[PDB]
Design a protein around this ligand. Sequence first.
Ligand code: 7O9
Ligand code: 7O9
Ligand code: 7O9
Lengths: 413, 413, 413
Amino acid sequence: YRKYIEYPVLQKILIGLILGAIVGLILGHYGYAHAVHTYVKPFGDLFVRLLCMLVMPIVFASLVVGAASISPARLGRVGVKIVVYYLLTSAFAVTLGIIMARLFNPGAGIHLAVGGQQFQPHQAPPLVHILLDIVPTNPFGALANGQVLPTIFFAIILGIAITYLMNSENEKVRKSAETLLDAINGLAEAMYKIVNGVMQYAPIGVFALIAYVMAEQGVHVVGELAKVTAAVYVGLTLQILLVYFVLLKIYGIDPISFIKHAKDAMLTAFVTRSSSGTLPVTMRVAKEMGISEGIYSFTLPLGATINMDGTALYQGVATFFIANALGSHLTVGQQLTIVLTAVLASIGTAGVPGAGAIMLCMVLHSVGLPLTDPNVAAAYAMILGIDAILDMGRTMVNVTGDLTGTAIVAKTE
Amino acid sequence: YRKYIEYPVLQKILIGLILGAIVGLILGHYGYAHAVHTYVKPFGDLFVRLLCMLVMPIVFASLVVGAASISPARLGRVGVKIVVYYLLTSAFAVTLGIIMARLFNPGAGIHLAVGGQQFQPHQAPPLVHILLDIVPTNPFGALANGQVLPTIFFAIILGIAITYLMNSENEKVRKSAETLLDAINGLAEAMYKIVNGVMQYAPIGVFALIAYVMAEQGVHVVGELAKVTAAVYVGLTLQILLVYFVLLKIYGIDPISFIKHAKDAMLTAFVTRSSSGTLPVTMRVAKEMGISEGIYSFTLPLGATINMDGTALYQGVATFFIANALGSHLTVGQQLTIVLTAVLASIGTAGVPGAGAIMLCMVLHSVGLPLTDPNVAAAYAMILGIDAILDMGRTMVNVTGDLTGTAIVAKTE
Amino acid sequence: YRKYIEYPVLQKILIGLILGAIVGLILGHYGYAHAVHTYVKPFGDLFVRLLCMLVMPIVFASLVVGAASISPARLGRVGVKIVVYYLLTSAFAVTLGIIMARLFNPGAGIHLAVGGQQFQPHQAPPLVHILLDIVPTNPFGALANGQVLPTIFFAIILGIAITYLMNSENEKVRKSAETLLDAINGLAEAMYKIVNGVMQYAPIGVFALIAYVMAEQGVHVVGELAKVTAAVYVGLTLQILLVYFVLLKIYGIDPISFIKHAKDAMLTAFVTRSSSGTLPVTMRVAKEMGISEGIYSFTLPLGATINMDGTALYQGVATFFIANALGSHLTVGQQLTIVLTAVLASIGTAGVPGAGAIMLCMVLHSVGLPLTDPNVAAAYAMILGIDAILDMGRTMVNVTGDLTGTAIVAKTE
Ligand SMILES: N[C@H](C(=O)O)[C@H](OCc1cccc(NC(=O)c2ccc(C(F)(F)F)cc2)c1)C(=O)O
Ligand SMILES: N[C@H](C(=O)O)[C@H](OCc1cccc(NC(=O)c2ccc(C(F)(F)F)cc2)c1)C(=O)O
Ligand SMILES: N[C@H](C(=O)O)[C@H](OCc1cccc(NC(=O)c2ccc(C(F)(F)F)cc2)c1)C(=O)O
C-alpha cells in the first residue's frame, strides 16, 4: 500500500495503461469477454464517476479565485499582450483541430453500442440561442445541473465583483468580501487535494476501462486509433508550420534560425512528456536569444500553465472521435461551443493537478455527451488507450508555443 | 464608452425607452419587422436573461442578512408599530390593485402569440396546498429551481437562527456564525455590484425589447396601455382617498389640513421620480407638523426603503396585465400568492439598486409566469414601455404613504 | 405561549401523542372523519414538511465537521477498536431487524390508499449499479435532489480533505481551510437551532397526524401495531441474547455474572427513556467492574452518542412496515441499502437534537419512499403512534450495548 502510493503517479498510470491493453486483448481473444464485462467494468465505471464528480466544484471555485486574483494595472502591458496572444493561438488551435478532424473522419465506421442500443442525440438549438444560453437563467440551477458554460460566466462575474469589493472604502464590506474569497479558496484547495487521491486511484480504473474495451472490440480499434493519431500528428505539424511560421515571419524573425536554436530545449519535451518539468531547460534557450530578463522571467512560467496549444488541438480531435464513434452529428453552433469551451477551460483550469482529464470532461459536458452514458465511456477509453503518443506530441507543441510567443513580445517592445 | 458610463443611468434608460418606442413604431409601419425580429431581439433576450439571473442570489443573501440584522428589543415600540403599519398598508395596496385590475380587465383582447402558439398555463394547486408549499421540502432544491416562496422562508429562518447563535455563550459557535454571516454578506454585496453593471447594460436591451415589440404589434398596444394606465391611476387615487383618509380620520387628524401642508413636498415626488431623492425635502414637511424629532428622524428613512405602496399596487396591475394578455386565468390561491409575494418582496429587497425589476421578476416567478417564455417578455416589454408615467404616479403615492404613517405614530405616542 | 414553551419537550410530545390517539379514535367512531381530513390534516402535513426540510443541510454540514474533527493518531487504539465494534454491532443489529421483519411480515394486509390510488413503486436498479451510485455524478446535483448516499460520501470526502489542508505548511491555504470549516460549522449549528424550534412545533403536528390516521382507519391498526411491537421485542431480546452473549462468551467474560451486575443501571433505561440521562448512573456500574479509568471515562460518553443498536433494529422493522403497508416489495440491493444507510446515519447524526426523526427520514429517502407522498405519512404516523413502548425497549438495549462493549476492550487491553 505505502510502496504503491510512493510510486510516481504518471509512470504508474502509464504502466497501468500498458498492462491493461495487452491483458484486455488476450482476454478478448480467448473468449472470456463476458466475465470481464461482469466483474471488471464496475472498477472503471467507479473511476469515470470519480472523474465526473470533480469537474463541477473546480470550475467554479478555481475560476472565482483566478478572476479575483487579476489586476489589469498591476499586470503590465506585456502581460495583456501575451494573454491576447495565448487565447488567440489557443482558439486557432481548436479551430485547426476541428478542421483536421473533419478532413480525416476518425471513428466513422465503428457503430458502437454497449447496452444494446445506440446513443440517442439531443436536439441542438440554433446559433443565436446558445450565445443567449451562455448567461444562466438561475446561477444555482446552473451548478445543480451540469451546465459548464452557464457556470463559467457566473464564476468570472462573481470574481470580478469580489475584486471591486475588496478595494472599497468601507470596512465591513471589505471584511465580508475577504472572508467570502477565503472560503471559496478553501473549497478550491480542498478540491485540489481530492484530485490528488482520485489520481492515485486512477491506475486501477484505467486498467479496468482498457481491459474492458479492448476485450469487447479488440481488432478494428487499432486501425481506428491509428487514424486518430495520424489525424492528430498531421494537424499538429500543420499547426506548427502554418500558425507559428506565419506569426514569426509577419514580425520579421527568421523562423528557421529561430527553431534551430530552440531545438535544444524543444527536443526534450518529446522525451519528458511534461511542459512544466522542462521549464528550467527552456529558460536556458529563452536566455540564448536576445530576450531581456523582465520578459522571459515572467512569461514562460505563465506560458507553461495557460498557453496549451497541442492540448487544445487534441481536445478537438478527441471530441470529434467520440461523436463520430457514437453515431451523432455535431452541427455548427455546438461546433464553436467546443472552441469557446476549450479556450476557457485552458484559462480556467490552470494549476489543477487533474487538468488533462477534467479539461476534456468539461468539454464533453458542454457538447452534450456526458461520461456516465456507457457509449461515451468506451470511446473515451479508446482515447485514453492511445493517449501516450499523443501526449508526447502535445508536450512537443506545448513547449514550442511559448518560445514562439515571447519572441514576438520581445520584438514589439 | 467612458462618456457613456458616466451618464446617469435612470435618464439613460428613459431616453433608451423613448428612442426605442418611436423607432420600433416606424420600423413596424414600414414593413421591416422580420429583420428586427431576426437581428435585434437577441439583444433584448440577453437583457431579460441577465435580469432573471440576479433574482435568486439576492432574495436569499439579502434576506438572510436583513433577518440577521433585526433585534426586537433594540428596535423600539415605535419601530414595531410602524413595521406593522407598513406591511398592513402594503398588503391592502396589493389587494386594491388586484381589485382595480379585475374591474377594468386590461390586456383582455390581445391574444398574444410570439412563436406561433399560445402560453400553456400550469395547473394551479388548491388553496390549502400552497400554504403547505410555502415551507420547502428541500432547502437546496428550492434554490436550484426557482421557488421564490420556498426560499424566502428558508432565508428568514436561517437569519433568525444566526441571530440566536451570535449572542451565544460559547466562543467557537460565535466565531462560526460570525464567519457565516460575513460570507453571506459578501455574496449579497457582490450581487449588488453585479446589479450595477446589468443596469448599465439595460439601455441597450430595453431599446431592443421596445423596438421588437412595437414593431410586432404597433397600433392596438397604445389603446391597451392607455387602459392599463387608466386602471393604475383610478385605483391609485382611490388608494390615497379610501385608505389614507380612513386611516387618518379614524385617529382624529384632519386629512384636508394635513395634505394641504404635505403638498409642498408631495408635489416634488411627481416631478422627481425618486422616493429617496426627495428625502431631505420631505424631512422639512415632517418638521412642519408637530412631530417630535425622535420619530421623524428614524421613520422616514425607513419609509423610503420599506414602505412602497404605489409600487405594490402597480405590481398587481402589471401582473394581471401579463396573465390577461397571455390568455391565462389566475385562480384564487395564486391570487393571494401575489399579495404574499409582493409584501415580502418589499420587505426583502430593501436597498438593492435593481429593486424595480427584480421585485416584479420574483412575483412573476411566484405566480408561474417565467420571463424566459417568449410570450411573457413581450407583455413585460409593453409594461416597461408604459412604465414612465406609472413611475411618476408611483413615486407620488410612495412619498405620501410615509407622511400619512408618521402622523399616526405621533398621534398614539 | 411562554408557559407552553417552558414545558419539557419530550413529555410534551408524548402527551400530544396520547391526547391525539384517543381523540382520533372517538372522532373516527362517531363519523366525523371527513371534517378531520379537511381541517386537521394540513397541520400534520406542515409538520412532515418541516421534518423533511431539515434532513438535507444537517447530513452535509454535521458530517463535514465530524469528519474534519477526527485524527487517527490522537484517537487511540482503544478508540479505533471501539469504533470498529460499534459499527459492526450496529450493522448486525440492522441485519437482525430486517430478518425479524421478514419473518413476521408486519403491515402486510392493510392495503393503504389515502388519495384513492396506491403507492407506485420505482424500478430498483441491480446490485452492482447501486454501489456505483454511492459516488455522486454531480456533488451539487446530489444535494439539489434528495440523494442521501451520494451526499454522505461527498461530505466525508470533503471533511478528510479539509483535515489534510488544515495542517499544511503554507499559511494562506490554512487560513482558507479554517474559514471554510468555520462557515460549515456555523451552518451546522444554525440547523441545530432550527431543529429546536421544529421540535417545539412537534406536539401539534404529531397530534394532527394521529388524530387523522386513527380517525381514518381506527380498528385494524391496533392489531397491526401489536404485530409490529411483537416483531420488535422478540428480535430485540434475540439481539441481546445472540449477539451480546456470543460476543461476551467468545472473550471469556461470564455473561450471567456480567448482566447481574449491569442490571442496576440497565433497568433505569427502561423507565428513563434516555440513553444520555442515564450516563451518570451507568458510570457507576462501569466503575463497579474491574474497568480502568482511562477506558470507561472516554468510551461510555462515546457509546451514548454513536453506538445505537435498538434504534438500528427499529429502523429496519419500521422501514419494512412502511413498505409492507404501502404494497411495495423491497428487493435485495435496496435491502442492504437500509443497512449501509442506518449505520452511516448513526455515525453521521451524532449529537443532533432531532436524531430520532431525521435518522428515519434519511433512510426512507434512501430507499425511495419520501415522506411527502400521502401514503407514506399515514404509516409513518402509525409508527409514531406506537413509538413510545418501542422507545422504552430501544433505550433498554441502547444502554446495554455499551456495557457489553467496554468490557471487551478492557479484556483485550
Ligand atoms: N501534455 C501537457 C503536459 O503534460 O504538460 C498537458 O498538460 C496538462 C496536464 C498537466 C498535469 C496533469 C495532467 N493530467 C494528466 O496527464 C492525466 C492523464 C490521464 C488521466 C486519466 F486518469 F487517465 F484520465 C488523468 C490525467 C495534464 C497534457 O498532458 O495534456
Ligand atoms: N417609484 C419608486 C422610486 O423610484 O423611488 C420605486 O422605487 C423602487 C426602485 C428604486 C431604485 C431603483 C429601481 N429600479 C428601477 O427603477 C428600474 C426601472 C427599469 C428597469 C428595467 F431595466 F427597465 F427593467 C430596471 C430597474 C426601483 C419604483 O421605481 O418602483
Ligand atoms: N431511544 C434512544 C434515546 O432516547 O436515547 C434513541 O435516542 C435517539 C434520540 C436522541 C435525542 C432525541 C431524539 N428524538 C426523538 O426522540 C423524537 C421522537 C419523536 C419525534 C417526532 F416528532 F414525533 F417525529 C421526533 C424526535 C432521538 C431514540 O430515541 O431512538
